[PDB]
Amino acid sequence: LGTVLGNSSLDKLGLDKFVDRFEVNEAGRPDGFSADYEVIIRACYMQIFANAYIMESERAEMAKAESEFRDGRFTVKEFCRALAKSYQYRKRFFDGRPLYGAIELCFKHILGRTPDGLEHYRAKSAVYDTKGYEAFIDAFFDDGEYDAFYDSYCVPFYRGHLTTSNLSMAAFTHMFQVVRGSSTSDKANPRTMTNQITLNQAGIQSIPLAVVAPGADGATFLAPDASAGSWQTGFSGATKARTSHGSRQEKGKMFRIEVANNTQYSAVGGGSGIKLQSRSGKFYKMRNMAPAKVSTFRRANNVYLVPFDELSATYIKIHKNGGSIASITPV
Amino acid sequence: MLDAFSRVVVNSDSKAAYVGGSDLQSLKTFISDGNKRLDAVNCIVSNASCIVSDAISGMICENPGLIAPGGNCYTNRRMAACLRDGEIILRYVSYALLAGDSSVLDDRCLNGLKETYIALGVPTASTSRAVSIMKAASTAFIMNTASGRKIEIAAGDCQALQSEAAAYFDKVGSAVD
Amino acid sequence: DIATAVYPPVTPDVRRAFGAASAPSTVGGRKAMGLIKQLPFWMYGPPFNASKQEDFEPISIANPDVSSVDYQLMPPGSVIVQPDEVSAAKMLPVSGMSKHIGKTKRLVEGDGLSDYSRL
Amino acid sequence: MKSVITTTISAADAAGRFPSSSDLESIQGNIQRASARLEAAEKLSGNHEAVVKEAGDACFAKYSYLKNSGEAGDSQEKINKCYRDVDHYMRLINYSLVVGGTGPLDEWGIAGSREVYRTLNLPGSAYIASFTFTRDRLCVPRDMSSQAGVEFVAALDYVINSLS
Amino acid sequence: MKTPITEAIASADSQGRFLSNAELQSITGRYQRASASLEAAKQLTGNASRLITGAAQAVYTKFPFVTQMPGPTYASNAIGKAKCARDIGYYLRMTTYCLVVGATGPMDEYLVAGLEEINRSFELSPSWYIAALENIKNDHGLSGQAANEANTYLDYAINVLS
Amino acid sequence: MKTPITEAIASADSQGRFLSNAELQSITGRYQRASASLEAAKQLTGNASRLITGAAQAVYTKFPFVTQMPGPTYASNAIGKAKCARDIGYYLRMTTYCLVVGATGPMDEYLVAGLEEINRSFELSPSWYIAALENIKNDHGLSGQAANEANTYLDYAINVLS
Amino acid sequence: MKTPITEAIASADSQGRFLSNAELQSITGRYQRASASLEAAKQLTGNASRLITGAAQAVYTKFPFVTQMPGPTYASNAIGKAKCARDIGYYLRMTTYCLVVGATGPMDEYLVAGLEEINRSFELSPSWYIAALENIKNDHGLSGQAANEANTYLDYAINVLS
Amino acid sequence: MLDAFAKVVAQADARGEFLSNKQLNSLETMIGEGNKRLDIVNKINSNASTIVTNSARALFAEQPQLIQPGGNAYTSRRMAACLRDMEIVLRYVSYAMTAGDSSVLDDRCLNGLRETYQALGTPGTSVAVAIQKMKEASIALANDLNGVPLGDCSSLNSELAVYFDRAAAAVV
Amino acid sequence: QLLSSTRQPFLESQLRFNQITVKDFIKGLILSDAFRYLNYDVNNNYRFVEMCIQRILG
Numbered sequence A: 001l002g003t004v005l006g007n008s009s010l011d012k013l014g015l016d017k018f019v020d021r022f023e024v025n026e027a028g029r030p031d032g033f034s035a036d037y038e039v040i041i042r043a044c045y046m047q048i049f050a051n052a053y054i055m056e057s058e059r060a061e062m063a064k065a066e067s068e069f070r071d072g073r074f075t076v077k078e079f080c081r082a083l084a085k086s087y088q089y090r091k092r093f094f095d096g097r098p099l100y101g102a103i104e105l106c107f108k109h110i111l112g113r114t115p116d117g118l119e120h121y122r123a124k125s126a127v128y129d130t131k132g133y134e135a136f137i138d139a140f141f142d143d144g145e146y147d148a149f150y151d152s153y154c155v156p157f158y159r160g161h162l163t164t165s166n167l168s169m170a171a172f173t174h175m176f177q178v179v180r181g182s183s184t185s186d187k188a189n190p191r192t193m194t195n196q197i198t199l200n201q202a203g204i205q206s207i208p209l210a211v212v213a214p215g216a217d218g219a220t221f222l223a224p225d226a227s228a229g230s231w232q233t234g235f236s237g238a239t240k241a242r243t244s245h246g247s248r249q250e251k252g253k254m255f256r257i258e259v260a261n262n263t264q265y266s267a268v269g270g271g272s273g274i275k276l277q278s279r280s281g282k283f284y285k286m287r288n289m290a291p292a293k294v295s296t297f298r299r300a301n302n303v304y305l306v307p308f309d310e311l312s313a314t315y316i317k318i319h320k321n322g323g324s325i326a327s328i329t330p331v
Numbered sequence B: 001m002l003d004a005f006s007r008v009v010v011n012s013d014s015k016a017a018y019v020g021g022s023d024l025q026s027l028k029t030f031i032s033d034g035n036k037r038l039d040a041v042n043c044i045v046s047n048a049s050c051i052v053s054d055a056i057s058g059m060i061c062e063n064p065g066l067i068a069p070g071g072n073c074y075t076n077r078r079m080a081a082c083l084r085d086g087e088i089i090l091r092y093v094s095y096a097l098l099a100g101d102s103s104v105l106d107d108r109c110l111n112g113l114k115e116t117y118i119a120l121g122v123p124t125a126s127t128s129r130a131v132s133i134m135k136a137a138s139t140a141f142i143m144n145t146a147s148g149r150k151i152e153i154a155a156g157d158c159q160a161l162q163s164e165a166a167a168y169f170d171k172v173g174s175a176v177d
Numbered sequence C: 001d002i003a004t005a006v007y008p009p010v011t012p013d014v015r016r017a018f019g020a021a022s023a024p025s026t027v028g029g030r031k032a033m034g035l036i037k038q039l040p041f042w043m044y045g046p047p048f049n050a051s052k053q054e055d056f057e058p059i060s061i062a063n064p065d066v067s068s069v070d071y072q073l074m075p076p077g078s079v080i081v082q083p084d085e086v087s088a089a090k091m092l093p094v095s096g097m098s099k100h101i102g103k104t105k106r107l108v109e110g111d112g113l114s115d116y117s118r119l
Numbered sequence D: 001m002k003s004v005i006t007t008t009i010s011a012a013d014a015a016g017r018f019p020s021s022s023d024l025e026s027i028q029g030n031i032q033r034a035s036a037r038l039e040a041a042e043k044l045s046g047n048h049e050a051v052v053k054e055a056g057d058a059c060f061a062k063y064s065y066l067k068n069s070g071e072a073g074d075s076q077e078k079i080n081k082c083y084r085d086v087d088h089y090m091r092l093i094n095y096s097l098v099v100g101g102t103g104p105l106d107e108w109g110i111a112g113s114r115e116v117y118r119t120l121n122l123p124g125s126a127y128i129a130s131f132t133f134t135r136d137r138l139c140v141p142r143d144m145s146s147q148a149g150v151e152f153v154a155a156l157d158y159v160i161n162s163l164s
Numbered sequence E, F, G: 001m002k003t004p005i006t007e008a009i010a011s012a013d014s015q016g017r018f019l020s021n022a023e024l025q026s027i028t029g030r031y032q033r034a035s036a037s038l039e040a041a042k043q044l045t046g047n048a049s050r051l052i053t054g055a056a057q058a059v060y061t062k063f064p065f066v067t068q069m070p071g072p073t074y075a076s077n078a079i080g081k082a083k084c085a086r087d088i089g090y091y092l093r094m095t096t097y098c099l100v101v102g103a104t105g106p107m108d109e110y111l112v113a114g115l116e117e118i119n120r121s122f123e124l125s126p127s128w129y130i131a132a133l134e135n136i137k138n139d140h141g142l143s144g145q146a147a148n149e150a151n152t153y154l155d156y157a158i159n160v161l162s
Numbered sequence H: 001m002l003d004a005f006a007k008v009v010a011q012a013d014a015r016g017e018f019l020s021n022k023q024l025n026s027l028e029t030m031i032g033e034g035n036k037r038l039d040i041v042n043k044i045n046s047n048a049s050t051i052v053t054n055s056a057r058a059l060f061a062e063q064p065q066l067i068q069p070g071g072n073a074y075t076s077r078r079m080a081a082c083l084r085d086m087e088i089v090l091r092y093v094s095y096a097m098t099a100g101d102s103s104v105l106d107d108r109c110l111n112g113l114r115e116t117y118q119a120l121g122t123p124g125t126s127v128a129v130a131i132q133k134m135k136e137a138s139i140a141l142a143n144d145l146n147g148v149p150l151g152d153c154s155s156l157n158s159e160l161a162v163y164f165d166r167a168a169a170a171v172v
Numbered sequence I: 001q002l003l004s005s006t007r008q009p010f011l012e013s014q015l016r017f018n019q020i021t022v023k024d025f026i027k028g029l030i031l032s033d034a035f036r037y038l039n040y041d042v043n044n045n046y047r048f049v050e051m052c053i054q055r056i057l058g
Ligand SMILES: *[C@H](C)[C@H]1/C(=C/C2=NC(=C\c3[nH]c(C[C@H]4NC(=O)C(C=C)=C4C)c(C)c3CCC(=O)O)/C(CCC(=O)O)=C2C)NC(=O)[C@@H]1C
Pocket: A051, A052, A053, A182, A183, A184, A185, A186, A187, A188, B066, B071, B072, B073, B077, B078, B079, B081, B082, B083, B085, B086, B088, B089, B108, B109, B113, B116, B120, B122, B123, B126, B127, B130
């Protein structure tokens, strides 16, 4: 884990298991054997379902498609299409989500990049609205993109991280929000799940987020949302801004620090063991020296915008409250 | 994904020197202790579903609110995935027993699993209980002290190997909590 | 690292390192460098220009100001001159690195450490 | 980083199975060829200095146009970079010789070399002159064990055939 | 957790200085009183079950209405008796934790923190528990400094409840 | 002043609670290491004058320009030598105070607090003092744990000065 | 960086107002004294090498033990003399930067900020660099208001060091 | 925050059992080790500033990069921040040496530090070389036969080395 | 004391668009020259201590 060790940053970014590649090198028909194809078929489920779990009984759904992949019927382009159209892929990814989340998942499953700009969303949402679900899925597969990057005999892979796809810097960072390394499934992480559309404000406005590598503490941030002011009325409380304008720049460049796990038991004010306000157990902070029942940190995950000369102090304060640092980005 | 060999090389690469005598000496002791590691992995692999069955069944019987309606072991599908999860954890622990370094287990499965079990609503104490049962069961098979299987092997001491396997299971159990 | 922890080697001497870790830089004189361990020969090279422990010692500067040894006043026998290598081909390889001629002699393997810290 | 054990663990991992007796036979062969590999690693860490010194000296003994002008190295600094690069190479031959696959030599030394040697006007044939001098220099059964010699020659040949 | 070593570390950490001789002396004293504490922990662990059962019987003899009073909170049901020896078992376990640690950390972080809201929200009076800890204090049967240790922490839980 | 007892009481006072077992164990351990500390204080008090004289001779032999350099700050005047043994006497007395107290309180409040502005504003180099404390560390001639105590506090003053 | 213009803009920015007549007059006066400051910068840039070498010779003549004392910090090694003229060259370059800027910005942000912990942690002496800046103040050889400028900034660095 | 004892108790409560007498015998053994522990912490706390200074001298001598113009270490400000960071790491290694657990170090110092030294452009491996030098100076210092009654201490040196190795492993 | 003149628009519009905390707003508000002329320059250095320990700490 990290960057410097092993001279490879991208292994340690959580993309360790996504480098392996699968192509059917066998031409004609497979008779008798069924090792190599069951491997490729498994990688197709691992790619298109994105590591979602398929039960033995479920494997009976899509069994026809599966018995046509093994034959000369479907190239893996078209088998991947057949896995994509079936009732499974509809239940998990299409039916649970709003239309936009569904789109972003379809890029994670089929193309392995994120959408970078709103217009990609314009294209796919437009096709869905004019013609329906099957033409939506065709509109992913029936494009110069899939054909060029995969060539019809190779199982899809995550390429959104890669430099070769032009994408956007935004789509690189967005790439790591959508893929959280081996264990996390489609609904395994928060930010996807079932009813969530994952990144919407981010993916629509091409707000490049930040990357928290998976693990090493602070693996989860799930940073709080912001509203938009008097027009489209908002609550101003919850998050620090991504911007930091003038008047406070003085005193060093501004850094956005995201602290991840904040909890009462963890928050001690620097000295170990939990502080007891009354002689016997009243552990919340006394507001006006009268007992309150309000937690010290009120949402887990608060952010800090801190200029350079104030970093050290803030860096101490986080570790006083036992909060753990997700990432720090210069702004 | 790094073995004992790769780990030493990476450390001697940050040092920017050649491997050297002290490091090669310890690595010679690794290779001379190689067949013990081989037979060890053979023991855990040839008791796999046995360990996973007893471990997760013990996890349910210790804490019977999991199978009560509303728990995360309440359906066949949830129980199947929970059973499957236990099998996969035991699988990458077996890989960490082969490689001698936990780089495969850290980079592959340990990374992101706490936050996934958070995102699913999986109770973490119950998972650490399951990992602990796989730890005691797995060390009991690795030392041939199982109460249902006593196979014949060449005599020797593998206390060090057992402490190593207990280190990997304590790494997973500490990693989910 | 599992490989080292299970089969650890023995730790060597620590006299040189303790001499540097013990007292401050004005207390102990020459030892202070102590912790300078040995880099590969290319890192003494001109893009890196590393330093040696013999640089930090008083012995390295050693320049007499007002000083002439005559070497004509000596008895006729006792002027002896020795050349490390009596050949053309081996004093200079085709490439630049040399162990005799130039500044390239600075980048030989070994000699990175210093034994004057015994005072 | 490719080795015996990383190929078989990664291969059974891509399968989705626990490691059967096949992977165990593979790592059994690792611990069979181990002694010859580590003997070669001991002697390489023994005299790396003189190996790199003979390598660069013969590399400019062959091609003199390197110091002719801008092409190659015409200054002490560039020749310092020369001997440093051959230091890196023998150090990666030591590393791949310890690991026993061509993994660290491939990912650290070989992967994406071509853009670097191409862009920075570095001729690869001079590298090959250095390595083919050191390839020839070792004497069978004069220092290392005959199989160790084989191991060393194999790895060095891999470097040459990956270079140009 | 509040161990003496962790307040030593924590105090010097809040000051940003090293762990100079003051805190080292503190860790010394912990290392000395530790032995008596360990012996006391051994013997409390030895006769746990009869301490807990004896303590519940003392609470039942002191407050005989509790087994007679029909309700959820009182120990008339079999459930109620199970919660009874359950809770007294918790206090005994936290005392053994504090004897092992050497400070009042595990009691203050597992038991004392927020005990009031519980004794209120389930209407459980402090006095019944107090009688339990008095029987534990009488029947632990330790001797000497070990007994002074267990009497120290048990008395401390008594003064938390009132 | 920073004594172990006042750290204990001050921490419990900032928490508003009593002086439970943690701090009492701390005061125990202070009361055990105190005896070796007192013996060390006795013998430093015993041979003070030869330690001060010896230390000033070591500074003068290590830096021989100081007696030669004509100025106010240097020890060429008779006044300068009086300020020399005066200052070395201060350091020795503050070490004996910290041996008696058992923490680095009196050195941190009488000597360390504000020493930088003095060594600057009168151009007194930190190093000359370091050589003095090294000679005191060599010539105090204690043995055993007492020697570990005086070497602890003298080394502490050395690491304050640099 | 702390230039007069940036103090003007920074103050008005913290007040959120414009750059009213006060700050404009400030930038006027800076634009007038700037010319003599630039000539002084030209001539210090001109005779840098002899200023550095001469200053190191003055430090060596004032403190002759430095070349004789065996240590890392003293200028007895080859390395030590290189660090000697290196540091004096740094002081001279920061003076020329303050002459160009017109305020003490670059010295306060490149040199003054945290100089103390360096001169302590490497046991460097304030006096050695003070004697260096005295020789720079004697031998710069400027005349008139330019000499008042270089004497201003050089003296400023001297009063920072003590 | 957890020492040895808090880790044992915390696991014992995470399963909810008592301590067995085996556990208690282990604790008693670690207590008898505890005087040697305090001795090593005393040696570190004593000579610490010479450790940081000498290790930084060996760092700048072996790597002459950082003291040169444009170096991360360079400027008076940047040099002082460099030295202070080394003092930080040495302070917390003294803390984890006392606690017996590596929790305080991870919680207060190491965890999240990589995100900072990435965010500033600071070369991680140079920090790792610095911490290797403080490990050498500290371990050697810990193995001094001066002033202490003589006794066998290989396990404690091993553990202390594990703490420094964890610091250099967390920056790199 | 509060008036249209003293009022700081900029620390508001930063603090509204969650760019500073209320703590820094208070730190910032105090540093203002609209406070330096009006509460500081009149006071004796010992008495300005009083209004700060009272108006920040209560
Ligand atoms: C067993 C001790 C648990 C529990 C297990 C369940 N896991 C469920 C889902 C799930 N689990 C994982 C982690 C797993 N997948 C991997 O690919 C790897 C490693 C490579 C691991 C360790 C993932 C990613 C997922 C999401 C995808 C999927 O559904 O398979 C799960 C289903 C939860 C649900 O749908 O509600 C369960 C029940 N069961 C328990 O009772 C304990 C807490």
